[PDB]
């Protein structure tokens, strides 16, 4: 089965704890709901389930959207957001990609 | 902003299949009824009980739910039966196709 890559971070509780001193403009509660926990090295976060890691968050970027764009394969992402959400993010990026540059 | 069924008489699925008795066309009658449609009599004309959107000339491969969302995305029945994402996907898909098919 598609097993949780970090079982010790499966609980939301364990995840927000890592964001104790969060100086970055991306909301820590959003990140943790989206499966992420902080590493303690800048804004580096990682998904507890797929292990996908992300840094250098721009102030406006969305945790669930980023999760779906970079790591669409995540099972935690699938059972939380569903197929249509995931495919939606990718379609949108392709459309944008294609409209800009004509 | 009231958004109530345009033909409240056709709200029950059972009322809608009943209209398909002599259905002789490519597209599945249960799939049509399920999507909110009922037959009018004339040809392969169907209308959604809720939005009043009407459709004819069904190709054999075409999906009731998809066509409903493509043509009449505003329907409340469609929304609460399939959800925002579904509806917005059909549209995004069509925009991407058209866009790509150019160069
Ligand atoms: C919210 C996403 C942001 N807009 C973005 O695009 N970030 C990128 C990113 O996070 N990564 C891509 C490249 C950098 C990008 C920004 N400069 C590759 C994957 C990720 C990244 O840097 N991930 C790692 C990593 C660091 C060094 C070597 C290999 C992988 C990472 C590891 C652990 C925890 C977090 C991130
Ligand atoms: C799954 C639909 C099929 N692939 C399609 O594209 N059908 C179109 C369609 O149903 N309509 C579009 C144009 C014809 C197309 C068929 N060549 C316009 C809207 C719809 C249509 O014919 N709607 C009406 C209608 C309005 C004015 C005059 C004649 C028909 C309609 C009325 C009653 C019952 C069904 C449809
Ligand atoms: Zn993940
Ligand atoms: Zn409708």
UniProtKB/Swiss-Prot annotation, chain B:
Q: As annotated in Swiss-Prot or TrEMBL, what is the tissue specificity of this protein?
A: Expressed in colonic crypts (at protein level). Ubiquitous, except peripheral blood leukocytes.
Cysteine-cysteine disulfides: none
UniProt-reported outcome of changing residue 58 to A:
No effect on interaction with SEPTIN4 isoform ARTS
**Which superkingdom is the protein from?**
Eukaryota
Q: What processes in GO biological process is this protein linked to?
A: copper ion homeostasis; defense response to bacterium; DNA damage response; negative regulation of apoptotic process; negative regulation of tumor necrosis factor-mediated signaling pathway; neuron apoptotic process; nucleotide-binding oligomerization domain containing 1 signaling pathway; nucleotide-binding oligomerization domain containing 2 signaling pathway
What cellular component GO annotations does this protein have?
cytoplasm; cytosol; nucleoplasm; nucleus
Outcome when changing residue 91 to A: No effect on interaction with SEPTIN4 isoform ARTS
Renumbered to this chain, region (Required for interaction with SEPTIN4 isoform ARTS) spans: 10-25
Q: Which disease is it linked to?
A: Lymphoproliferative syndrome, X-linked, 2: A rare immunodeficiency characterized by extreme susceptibility to infection with Epstein-Barr virus (EBV). Symptoms include severe or fatal mononucleosis, acquired hypogammaglobulinemia, pancytopenia and malignant lymphoma.
Q: How does it assemble?
A: Monomer, and homodimer. Part of a complex composed of SEPTIN4 isoform ARTS, XIAP and BCL2, within the complex interacts with SEPTIN4 isoform ARTS and BCL2, SEPTIN4 isoform ARTS acts as a scaffold protein and stabilizes the complex. Interacts (via BIR3 domain) with DIABLO/SMAC; the interaction inhibits apoptotic suppressor activity. Interacts with HTRA2/PRSS25; the interaction inhibits apoptotic suppressor activity. Interacts with TAB1/MAP3K7IP1 and AIFM1. Interaction with DIABLO/SMAC hinders binding of TAB1/MAP3K7IP1 and AIFM1. Interacts with TCF25 and COMMD1.
UniProt name for this protein: E3 ubiquitin-protein ligase XIAP
From which source organism is this entry?
A: Homo sapiens (Human)
């Amino acid at each position: 089965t598609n097993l949780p890559r970090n079982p010790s971070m499966a609980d939301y509780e364990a995840r927000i704890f890592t964001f104790g001193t969060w100086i970055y403009s991306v909301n820590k509660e959003q990140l943790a709901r989206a499966g992420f926990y902080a590493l303690g090295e800048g804004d580096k976060v990682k998904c507890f389930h797929c292990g996908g890691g992300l840094t250098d968050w721009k102030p406006s970027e969305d945790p669930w959207e980023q999760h779906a764009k970079w790591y669409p394969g995540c099972k935690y992402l699938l059972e939380q957001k569903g197929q249509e959400y995931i495919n939606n993010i990718h379609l949108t990026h392709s459309l944008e990609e294609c409209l800009v540059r004509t």
